[PDB]
Amino acid sequence: ASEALTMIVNLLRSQRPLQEPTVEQMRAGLEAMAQMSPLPADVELTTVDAGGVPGAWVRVPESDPDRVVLYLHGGGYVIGSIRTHRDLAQRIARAARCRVLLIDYRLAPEHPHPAAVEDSTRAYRWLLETGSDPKRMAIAGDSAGGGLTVATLVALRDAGVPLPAAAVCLSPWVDLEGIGESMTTKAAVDPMVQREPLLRMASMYLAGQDPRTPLAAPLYADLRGLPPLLIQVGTAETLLDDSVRLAERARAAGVQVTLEPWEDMIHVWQAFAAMLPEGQQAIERIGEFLRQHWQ
Numbered sequence: 001a002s003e004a005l006t007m008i009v010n011l012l013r014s015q016r017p018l019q020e021p022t023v024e025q026m027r028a029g030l031e032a033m034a035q036m037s038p039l040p041a042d043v044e045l046t047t048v049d050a051g052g053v054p055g056a057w058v059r060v061p062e063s064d065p066d067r068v069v070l071y072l073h074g075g076g077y078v079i080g081s082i083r084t085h086r087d088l089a090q091r092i093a094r095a096a097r098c099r100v101l102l103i104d105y106r107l108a109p110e111h112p113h114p115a116a117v118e119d120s121t122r123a124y125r126w127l128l129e130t131g132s133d134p135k136r137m138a139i140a141g142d143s144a145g146g147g148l149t150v151a152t153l154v155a156l157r158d159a160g161v162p163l164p165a166a167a168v169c170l171s172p173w174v175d176l177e178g179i180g181e182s183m184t185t186k187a188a189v190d191p192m193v194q195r196e197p198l199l200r201m202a203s204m205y206l207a208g209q210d211p212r213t214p215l216a217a218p219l220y221a222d223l224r225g226l227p228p229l230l231i232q233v234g235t236a237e238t239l240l241d242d243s244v245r246l247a248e249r250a251r252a253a254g255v256q257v258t259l260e261p262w263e264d265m266i267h268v269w270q271a272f273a274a275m276l277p278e279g280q281q282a283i284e285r286i287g288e289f290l291r292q293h294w295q
């Protein structure tokens, strides 16, 4: 891996937003870290009411105005915001030459499951209502937002809503019990995600519901009929086996899955693309994948 990976690992070993003592401090910690990646001058942000869900349009100069990624931010269903993820959103908008709708879906513990999935499906339905075409759309998300991407597709399919051309999952979180082998075997090399904080956030999202509830933990969902899926994951991740098991389940369901394991990469390494070469390389691959499925 690039020497820059050592700098990102060192940052994460000291700035541990998932290990902050309160939800308020976890939220503020991730906001402080995102504020470091300064936004390019050519990014246009437009706040919008996406059918009752607050959102922001992210546009860059080469955004095709009729192609849209609905972007579902990570943060364990508890943290993250339009602010934390607008840099990753603009990088994807640039690579995929599209507009990104970044939504502020309801967060736990204030709004437990299924609030997040109600909001992601409402935003997608609103895009259709306002004239977006499914063959020029995609849903993408990181970590909890990667799990929410799969759950959103399942819920839309079950409601008879036309599915988009493709979907992208970045280090998705789909096992809310943390029982993947890598949760043990990669614990020593993951500077961000460990079982204790994952179970803390799962508790807030589930509010006593079965941790294998399919739209909360899509490792247990019926995935038949989903569109082509790109799963990017790092091998230095306790969540590696979330991606491996999701790929197995989607392939068994007849889905066109690409599983891309990036050697030595850490959780949502794409968010560090300003400093990490593999982050920008992975975002270029996301853009290639989306443009191929919109052809």
Ligand SMILES: COc1ccc2cc([C@@H](C)C(=O)O)ccc2c1
Pocket: 030, 033, 034, 035, 036, 037, 073, 074, 075, 076, 080, 084, 085, 142, 143, 144, 267, 268, 271, 272
């Ligand atoms: C430098 O900027 C960032 C921005 C968002 C980030 C999000 C995560 C995790 C919690 C995520 O939402 O998947 C990690 C690092 C991040 C760094």
